[PDB]
Amino acid sequence: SKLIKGIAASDGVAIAKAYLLVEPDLTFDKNEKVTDVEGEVAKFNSAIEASKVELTKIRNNAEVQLGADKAAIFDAHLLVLDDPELIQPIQDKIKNENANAATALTDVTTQFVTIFESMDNEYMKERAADIRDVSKRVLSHILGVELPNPSMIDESVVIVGNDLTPSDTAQLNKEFVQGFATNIGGRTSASAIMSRSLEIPAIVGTKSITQEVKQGDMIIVDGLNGDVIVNPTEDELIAYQDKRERYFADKKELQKLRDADTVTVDGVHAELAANIGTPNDLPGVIENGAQGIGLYRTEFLYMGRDQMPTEEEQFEAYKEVLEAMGGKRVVVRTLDIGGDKELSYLNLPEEMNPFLGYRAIRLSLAQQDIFRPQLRALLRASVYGKLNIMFPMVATINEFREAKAILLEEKENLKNEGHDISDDIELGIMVEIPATAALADVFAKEVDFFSIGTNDLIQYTLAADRMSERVSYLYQPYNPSILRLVKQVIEASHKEGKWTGMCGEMAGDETAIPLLLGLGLDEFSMSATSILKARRQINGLSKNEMTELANRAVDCATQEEVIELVNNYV
Amino acid sequence: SKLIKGIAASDGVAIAKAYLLVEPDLTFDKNEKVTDVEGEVAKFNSAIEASKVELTKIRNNAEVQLGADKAAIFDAHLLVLDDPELIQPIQDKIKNENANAATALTDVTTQFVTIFESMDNEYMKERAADIRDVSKRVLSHILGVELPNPSMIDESVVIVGNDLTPSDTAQLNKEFVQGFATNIGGRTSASAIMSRSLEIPAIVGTKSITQEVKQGDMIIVDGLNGDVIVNPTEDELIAYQDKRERYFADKKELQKLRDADTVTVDGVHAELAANIGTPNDLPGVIENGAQGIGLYRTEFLYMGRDQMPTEEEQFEAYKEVLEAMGGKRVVVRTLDIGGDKELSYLNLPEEMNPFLGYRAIRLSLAQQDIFRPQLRALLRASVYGKLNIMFPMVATINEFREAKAILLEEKENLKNEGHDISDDIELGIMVEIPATAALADVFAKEVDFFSIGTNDLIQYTLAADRMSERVSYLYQPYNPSILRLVKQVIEASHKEGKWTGMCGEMAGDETAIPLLLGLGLDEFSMSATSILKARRQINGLSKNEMTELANRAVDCATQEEVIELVNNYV
Ligand SMILES: [Ca+2]
Ligand SMILES: [Ca+2]
């Protein structure tokens, strides 16, 4: 009776009555002069403590109950409640201006949030989001009102609301909550990530859903194709019941693939790997039948520490992974901290444009006392599992020759000391610089393998920063220009008997896979949560047919042409 | 007897006795507490006025005597002497700290210069340079000492010194000054630009020249190949006398080319054009036998004004040029103000990385009320000369389709009003985005012509900012990656009967020309001062032979390989 399209954020088909997530009434008298200043201050302080304690409960029992690393967002919320930068100005305003806590809180929050959100930085945009969640909570206490939550208490419902706060999603009881649909939110948001973790169907960013649903209405959430249906007709209910069952069936046959090999209908093999940033992501990897690790981000090791990680710490983490993989490929990426990142412990110039300047291997070279410890640690850890090393931001040849020369320096350094190493350690490069693709066949002669970082490559090839909203529209992964460089790299590697993988998010995308297949892509690195689906898709395809499809795409004139070719190909 | 290599900054061979440019003794007692504060302040103020008047003489008679636009640097020096930001702190320091003017001047200057120089910005680096020149002058007055100058007074000398200040070079009397050689300085410095204007042989940045020469020594300056010779042997003198004469002969035969056509030995034509940023550069253009204008930078029109230029002003300037060219091609470039530029009158976000974000046609689109006036002005001016329009930073197709659609909007807007236009106006694009090269054959179908901006293309392809000294080494114009994109663009244009030009500095380079020839380059845009030399070189070459040379270059592995192939090709 009513179809509302949105962004699918979690697979599955949920069918239950609508539960409306009612929000607090945060209305209050502005500029109401307070009689008791110290009283008003204590009122605001009480709210802080009350919120602080509530968030400690949510946090600690979020982990131990569902991922010990997912509760990190809450550690980010509690931090906000401890930041003098944010609290002092509120207290100052109440004291000096005699403003009520409600107004002082609003004004200061609005000030900070506006500055951070109108700012081309991920971390800054993240803090604004957190400050939003906590201010609402704190304000709620101040006005003597309550936030929403999960206290049902029956029955099977579909949560309908504007947006689910990270605190709400962590409180969801999959026993009753069949799924949710909200006006706003993102496929990549923290709450929407906890969603697919709880395998709870969800579609997000619909804008209108809240105004389209009355409490008690039957709701179906098609997290498969991303559309919501309010008040289903008899025929629609019957049809989606079957779809929900097929979903469960597919889940079954999907688990019989965890140990199955990835082979196209016409005998062409591929390798499905997983991208990990922390050794806490290992469980998910083996569980999802991964053919190794194609991207191991080692920035998490260097970040958030007093001093840079010793060779020992590193060796410990590398050894652990190589073991956990029992001989399966592990591609470790040299330190590549984004020019626009933290690192509040290192010496680095402000640089007009960080994303073009001193970062990755550029930093690595000329800093061989901070880049070398990593290498000597990788060489000692190699005696365990199958190790691959690769350098980020290699734009030129003799850059690769210098780094490789540094590596062989250590293979000699350790040996003489008494340390044994493995003689088979592949050495490749992270392909993000367009220049490196332009000369692929030259690099292919010297490099053991390529792995494309679409995220970077797209920004450099099209010359636009995805962070800057002004030109973010130029983040076009299905752009023919990109496809051509991709193909160029792949062709070159096979010309030398090398292989090309892709550890950018595009590799795990169910719509970009058939193209990459047809281009000849050897390895697909993705989130472990997508490996099984990729294997199912690839095993049912013919490289021959996808080759012709790809050769039509590279000759398209716009991304719009490509996306349509793909969606309606015969 | 002594050969000192350096950077040639001006052609010619000068042979005369050494005149050493003696510098002032700026030594003084530091932290010498002053007795009379108001006296010391007036002492410093006197120096300011004395310098100010000296620089007004240098400035106004610099123009009217040699270019009315070259004296701009001095307008930049006088401005410094008027900047309260720089003066107040000196006066403040003398008053509060009782420091002598000499120390107060030194400390504040050192502070400002350090901050500006250690800063990845051209304008900021330019101000530091100016502050250096003026502080030295001002300090000179304060210490009761004199700066160097040109008061000879015989005879023919070669100026030897550490560096020539913009004030010294403008005082040079070509009647006596045969040429100069300095320890430091740049081929692109203002003073070194006035040098080639006065056709006075010069080599710069030798580091050692000052310590290698005694007053009165015979000096020969080979501004042709860039080496200095101190105390020439009898045989060397004889040989360089002949070289000086050949130089004069070559000058002669070079003027017989101003009206000659550019044609290779094997009948292959090319077009040598000139890059102009201001209509004051026209005289140089026609004088140097240019085949039109391949790059007309229109940023000088928008910059340094209260409000953006009306359609009228623009139409006036475009009409003037098109006339001055009597039917010769004029390629005008749409407004492209660098993200890291002034524009202290426009609304633009700070943006983390300007060089990737909101600039050129990106800005143009979404601002059709500030981009349209230019177009409607170009359409009305087209009825005069041969007009070509081209858009900067076009990374994608439908960007070009949108802009072209805007253009045709105006061709309709004017027509109905009563304004007549020319039906033949070519419309091409500035090729700086690597993505645009990757899809050249698609763009070639829709675009009338390509023109490569190496300056930008090199930075995007290799992903490094030339301004940032940390990664500036990646500004590699002879890199095989670049050559390949260049070739790719050229091939595509000819496949559609289009043409490709290059208005980057590389096009006018006597070492990059034979390569570009062999690549098939149709048009070469450069500084008018290089056109004649390019014609001489090209007219003496065979495209056939340079084709094979180019095809060996594109398959090189590094810039070092390419630069050597070129220098020692047979
Ligand atoms: Ca290099
Ligand atoms: Ca576009």
Side-chain angles (χ1 to χ4, degrees), chain A residues 1-150 155-206 208-299 301-302 304 308-339 349 351 353-354 356-414 416-570, chain B residues 1-150 155-206 208-299 301-302 304 308-339 349 351 353-354 356-414 416-570:
Chain A
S1 353
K2 268 184 240 190
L3 202 150
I4 307 284
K5 187 72 176 193
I7 306 303
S10 197
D11 295 348
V13 182
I15 302 178
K17 97 167 205 294
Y19 177 89
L20 274 46
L21 197 69
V22 289
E23 303 294 346
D25 186 298
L26 307 175
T27 294
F28 64 98
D29 183 25
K30 308 84 181 180
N31 291 174
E32 176 203 30
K33 301 307 172 185
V34 292
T35 300
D36 180 11
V37 173
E38 277 61 50
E40 196 69 21
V41 171
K43 184 176 190 173
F44 167 74
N45 294 171
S46 187
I48 298 299
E49 296 311 310
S51 288
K52 188 170 299 178
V53 61
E54 295 172 339
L55 288 175
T56 60
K57 315 294 174 61
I58 312 302
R59 183 217 65 188
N60 198 330
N61 87 347
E63 54 175 332
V64 173
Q65 181 271 169
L66 190 71
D69 50 29
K70 304 172 56 181
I73 183 59
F74 302 98
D75 282 311
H77 286 221
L78 282 163
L79 212 299
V80 174
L81 283 167
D82 281 344
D83 192 13
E85 179 188 344
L86 307 162
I87 307 301
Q88 295 283 185
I90 311 276
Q91 298 165 341
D92 288 350
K93 168 161 299 207
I94 299 170
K95 296 181 169 168
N96 296 109
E97 301 180 37
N98 287 234
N100 59 59
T103 45
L105 173 73
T106 306
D107 291 335
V108 174
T109 299
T110 296
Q111 290 168 185
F112 283 107
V113 170
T114 299
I115 302 299
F116 299 149
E117 283 187 340
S118 308
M119 198 160 163
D120 300 330
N121 188 21
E122 50 284 343
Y123 168 77
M124 293 307 181
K125 293 175 176 297
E126 292 299 340
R127 165 159 52 163
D130 302 342
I131 294 169
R132 286 182 170 278
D133 289 336
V134 305
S135 59
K136 299 175 190 301
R137 175 187 299 277
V138 163
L139 215 201
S140 180
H141 293 278
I142 290 171
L143 302 178
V145 72
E146 274 65 34
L147 296 171
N149 63 0
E155 345 86 50
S156 288
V157 303
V158 164
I159 306 289
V160 173
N162 184 53
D163 191 44
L164 278 191
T165 191
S167 172
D168 291 350
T169 56
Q171 297 169 336
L172 291 177
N173 191 5
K174 49 260 84 185
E175 177 189 357
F176 300 93
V177 184
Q178 308 302 127
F180 59 96
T182 54
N183 292 172
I184 78 180
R187 181 174 196 166
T188 60
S189 65
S191 66
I193 289 183
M194 299 182 183
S195 171
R196 52 174 63 95
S197 178
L198 293 152
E199 53 195 19
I200 291 181
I203 103 158
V204 82
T206 61
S208 174
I209 275 183
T210 281
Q211 287 72 45
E212 304 277 10
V213 172
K214 185 271 172 182
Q215 176 81 25
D217 290 357
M218 254 298 313
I219 308 291
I220 99 98
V221 173
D222 191 352
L224 261 30
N225 77 164
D227 47 39
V228 176
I229 301 187
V230 194
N231 304 313
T233 194
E234 187 170 0
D235 290 345
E236 284 163 349
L237 169 58
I238 287 162
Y240 280 99
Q241 281 172 345
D242 295 337
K243 179 166 183 173
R244 188 184 216 271
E245 301 313 288
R246 291 195 298 258
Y247 172 76
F248 278 97
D250 297 340
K251 293 277 280 293
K252 259 186 153 297
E253 60 173 331
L254 212 61
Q255 310 297 347
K256 310 162 192 163
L257 297 167
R258 299 197 283 181
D259 43 25
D261 211 314
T262 309
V263 195
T264 55
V265 171
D266 51 357
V268 180
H269 289 88
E271 171 178 312
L272 308 185
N275 307 328
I276 73 167
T278 56
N280 293 346
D281 300 359
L282 291 187
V285 172
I286 303 290
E287 150 190 322
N288 280 287
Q291 280 150 107
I293 290 171
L295 208 196
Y296 186 137
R297 288 172 283 259
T298 67
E299 298 84 38
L301 188 65
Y302 281 85
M308 67 97 176
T310 172
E311 174 191 342
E312 192 54 28
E313 293 186 35
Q314 308 172 158
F315 163 82
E316 306 285 43
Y318 307 140
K319 172 187 178 288
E320 174 172 337
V321 190
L322 266 33
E323 285 180 336
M325 284 314 169
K328 284 183 290 300
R329 175 187 320 269
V330 175
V331 184
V332 178
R333 176 179 78 174
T334 283
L335 178 64
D336 178 5
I337 183 67
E351 65 193 345
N353 287 359
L356 280 174
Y358 207 56
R359 57 170 294 190
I361 203 180
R362 252 96 95 152
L363 168 50
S364 156
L365 303 182
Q367 296 281 358
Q368 308 179 1
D369 73 337
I370 215 282
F371 163 68
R372 206 171 293 250
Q374 188 169 21
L375 299 177
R376 36 173 43 246
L378 296 160
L379 275 46
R380 302 206 295 107
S382 73
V383 297
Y384 300 102
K386 179 175 178 46
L387 181 67
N388 288 181
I389 307 183
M390 73 164 181
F391 314 121
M393 295 284 286
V394 173
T396 50
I397 283 287
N398 52 42
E399 267 188 334
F400 171 89
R401 296 181 172 176
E402 290 177 22
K404 178 189 180 66
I406 292 186
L407 191 70
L408 287 179
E409 270 182 294
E410 298 318 80
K411 185 173 182 176
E412 194 76 337
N413 273 5
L414 303 174
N416 303 1
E417 300 175 12
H419 303 92
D420 288 12
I421 45 78
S422 64
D423 68 349
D424 195 348
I425 303 175
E426 298 186 43
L427 194 280
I429 65 171
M430 187 84 171
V431 174
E432 51 247 294
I433 314 291
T436 207
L439 209 67
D441 44 302
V442 171
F443 279 93
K445 288 277 179 58
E446 304 180 38
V447 166
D448 280 333
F449 63 92
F450 296 115
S451 72
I452 314 178
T454 55
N455 33 209
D456 311 73
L457 182 58
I458 298 176
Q459 285 176 293
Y460 295 121
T461 293
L462 291 158
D465 191 342
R466 67 190 303 175
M467 259 32 271
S468 175
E469 298 288 31
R470 291 83 274 257
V471 300
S472 58
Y473 72 97
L474 295 161
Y475 193 87
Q476 307 180 193
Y478 300 102
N479 188 121
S481 299
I482 313 309
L483 303 171
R484 291 187 170 186
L485 302 193
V486 171
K487 173 174 187 166
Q488 202 176 221
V489 166
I490 299 174
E491 301 289 40
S493 70
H494 302 153
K495 181 185 192 303
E496 305 300 336
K498 274 47 182 183
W499 64 269
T500 296
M502 175 174 300
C503 64
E505 292 293 321
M506 153 169 278
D509 196 311
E510 293 288 313
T511 50
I513 287 164
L515 277 190
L516 298 177
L517 215 195
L519 286 175
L521 191 54
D522 305 304
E523 192 215 40
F524 297 68
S525 266
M526 58 194 83
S527 292
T529 53
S530 294
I531 288 172
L532 268 18
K533 286 59 55 195
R535 191 164 300 155
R536 187 199 77 269
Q537 180 177 21
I538 296 177
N539 290 7
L541 289 169
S542 158
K543 202 215 82 173
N544 197 47
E545 306 170 358
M546 288 313 92
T547 279
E548 160 58 358
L549 169 57
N551 294 357
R552 286 171 59 175
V554 287
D555 283 9
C556 287
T558 182
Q559 187 182 221
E560 168 269 344
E561 281 189 4
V562 171
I563 180 64
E564 296 161 4
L565 205 204
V566 180
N567 293 158
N568 300 62
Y569 188 75
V570 300
Chain B
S1 353
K2 268 184 240 190
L3 202 150
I4 307 284
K5 187 72 176 193
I7 306 303
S10 197
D11 295 348
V13 182
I15 302 178
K17 97 167 205 294
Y19 177 89
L20 274 46
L21 197 69
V22 289
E23 303 294 346
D25 186 298
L26 307 175
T27 294
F28 64 98
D29 183 25
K30 308 84 181 180
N31 291 174
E32 176 203 30
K33 301 307 172 185
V34 292
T35 300
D36 180 11
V37 173
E38 277 61 50
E40 196 69 21
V41 171
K43 184 176 190 173
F44 167 74
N45 294 171
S46 187
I48 298 299
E49 296 311 310
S51 288
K52 188 170 299 178
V53 61
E54 295 172 339
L55 288 175
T56 60
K57 315 294 174 61
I58 312 302
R59 183 217 65 188
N60 198 330
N61 87 347
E63 54 175 332
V64 173
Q65 181 271 169
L66 190 71
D69 50 29
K70 304 172 56 181
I73 183 59
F74 302 98
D75 282 311
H77 286 221
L78 282 163
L79 212 299
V80 174
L81 283 167
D82 281 344
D83 192 13
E85 179 188 344
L86 307 162
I87 307 301
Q88 295 283 185
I90 311 276
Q91 298 165 341
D92 288 350
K93 168 161 299 207
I94 299 170
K95 296 181 169 168
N96 296 109
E97 301 180 37
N98 287 234
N100 59 59
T103 45
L105 173 73
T106 306
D107 291 335
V108 174
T109 299
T110 296
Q111 290 168 185
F112 283 107
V113 170
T114 299
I115 302 299
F116 299 149
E117 283 187 340
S118 308
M119 198 160 163
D120 300 330
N121 188 21
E122 50 284 343
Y123 168 77
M124 293 307 181
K125 293 175 176 297
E126 292 299 340
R127 165 159 52 163
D130 302 342
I131 294 169
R132 286 182 170 278
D133 289 336
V134 305
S135 59
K136 299 175 190 301
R137 175 187 299 277
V138 163
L139 215 201
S140 180
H141 293 278
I142 290 171
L143 302 178
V145 72
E146 274 65 34
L147 296 171
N149 63 0
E155 345 86 50
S156 288
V157 303
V158 164
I159 306 289
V160 173
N162 184 53
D163 191 44
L164 278 191
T165 191
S167 172
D168 291 350
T169 57
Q171 297 169 336
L172 291 177
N173 191 5
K174 49 260 84 185
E175 177 189 357
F176 300 93
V177 184
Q178 308 302 127
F180 59 96
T182 54
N183 292 172
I184 78 180
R187 181 174 196 166
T188 60
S189 65
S191 66
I193 289 183
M194 299 182 183
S195 171
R196 52 174 63 95
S197 178
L198 293 152
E199 53 195 19
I200 291 181
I203 103 158
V204 82
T206 61
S208 174
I209 275 183
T210 281
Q211 287 72 45
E212 304 277 10
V213 172
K214 185 271 172 182
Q215 176 81 25
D217 290 357
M218 254 298 313
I219 308 291
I220 99 98
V221 173
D222 191 352
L224 261 30
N225 77 164
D227 47 39
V228 176
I229 301 187
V230 194
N231 304 313
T233 194
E234 187 170 0
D235 290 345
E236 284 163 349
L237 169 58
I238 287 162
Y240 280 99
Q241 281 172 345
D242 295 337
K243 179 166 183 173
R244 188 184 216 271
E245 301 313 288
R246 291 195 298 258
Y247 172 76
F248 278 97
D250 297 340
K251 293 277 280 293
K252 259 186 153 297
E253 60 173 331
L254 212 61
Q255 310 297 347
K256 310 162 192 163
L257 297 167
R258 299 197 283 181
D259 43 25
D261 211 314
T262 309
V263 195
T264 55
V265 171
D266 51 357
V268 180
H269 289 88
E271 171 178 312
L272 308 185
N275 307 328
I276 73 167
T278 56
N280 293 346
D281 300 359
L282 291 187
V285 172
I286 303 290
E287 150 190 322
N288 280 287
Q291 280 150 107
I293 290 171
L295 208 196
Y296 186 137
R297 288 172 283 259
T298 67
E299 298 84 38
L301 188 65
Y302 281 85
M308 67 97 176
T310 172
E311 174 191 342
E312 192 54 28
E313 293 186 35
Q314 308 172 158
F315 163 82
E316 306 285 43
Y318 307 140
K319 172 187 178 288
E320 174 172 337
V321 190
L322 266 33
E323 285 180 336
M325 284 314 169
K328 284 183 290 300
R329 175 187 320 269
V330 175
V331 184
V332 178
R333 176 179 78 174
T334 283
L335 178 64
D336 178 5
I337 183 67
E351 65 193 345
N353 287 359
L356 280 174
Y358 207 56
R359 57 170 294 190
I361 203 180
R362 252 96 95 152
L363 168 50
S364 156
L365 303 182
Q367 296 281 358
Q368 308 179 1
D369 73 337
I370 215 282
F371 163 68
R372 206 171 293 250
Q374 188 169 21
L375 299 177
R376 36 173 43 246
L378 296 160
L379 275 46
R380 302 206 295 107
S382 73
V383 297
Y384 300 102
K386 179 175 178 46
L387 181 67
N388 288 181
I389 307 183
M390 73 164 181
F391 314 121
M393 295 284 286
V394 173
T396 50
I397 283 287
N398 52 42
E399 267 188 334
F400 171 89
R401 296 181 172 176
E402 290 177 22
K404 178 189 180 66
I406 292 186
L407 191 70
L408 287 179
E409 270 182 294
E410 298 318 80
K411 185 173 182 176
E412 194 76 337
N413 273 5
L414 303 174
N416 303 1
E417 300 175 12
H419 303 92
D420 288 12
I421 45 78
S422 64
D423 68 349
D424 195 348
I425 303 175
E426 298 186 43
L427 194 280
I429 65 171
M430 187 84 171
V431 174
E432 51 247 294
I433 314 291
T436 207
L439 209 67
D441 44 302
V442 171
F443 279 93
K445 288 277 179 58
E446 304 180 38
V447 166
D448 280 333
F449 63 92
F450 296 115
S451 72
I452 314 178
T454 55
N455 33 209
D456 311 73
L457 182 58
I458 298 176
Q459 285 176 293
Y460 295 121
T461 293
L462 291 158
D465 191 342
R466 67 190 303 175
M467 259 32 271
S468 175
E469 298 288 31
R470 291 83 274 257
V471 300
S472 58
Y473 72 97
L474 295 161
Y475 193 87
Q476 307 180 193
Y478 300 102
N479 188 121
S481 299
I482 313 309
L483 303 171
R484 291 187 170 186
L485 302 193
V486 171
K487 173 174 187 166
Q488 202 176 221
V489 166
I490 299 174
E491 301 289 40
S493 70
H494 302 153
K495 181 185 192 303
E496 305 300 336
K498 274 47 182 183
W499 64 269
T500 296
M502 175 174 300
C503 64
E505 292 293 321
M506 153 169 278
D509 196 311
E510 293 288 313
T511 50
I513 287 164
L515 277 190
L516 298 177
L517 215 195
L519 286 175
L521 191 54
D522 305 304
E523 192 215 40
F524 297 68
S525 266
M526 58 194 83
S527 292
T529 53
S530 294
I531 288 172
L532 268 18
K533 286 59 55 195
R535 191 164 300 155
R536 187 199 77 269
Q537 180 177 21
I538 296 177
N539 290 7
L541 289 169
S542 158
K543 202 215 82 173
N544 197 47
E545 306 170 358
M546 288 313 92
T547 279
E548 160 58 358
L549 169 57
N551 294 357
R552 286 171 59 175
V554 287
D555 283 9
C556 287
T558 182
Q559 187 182 221
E560 168 269 344
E561 281 189 4
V562 171
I563 180 64
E564 296 161 4
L565 205 204
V566 180
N567 293 158
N568 300 62
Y569 188 75
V570 300

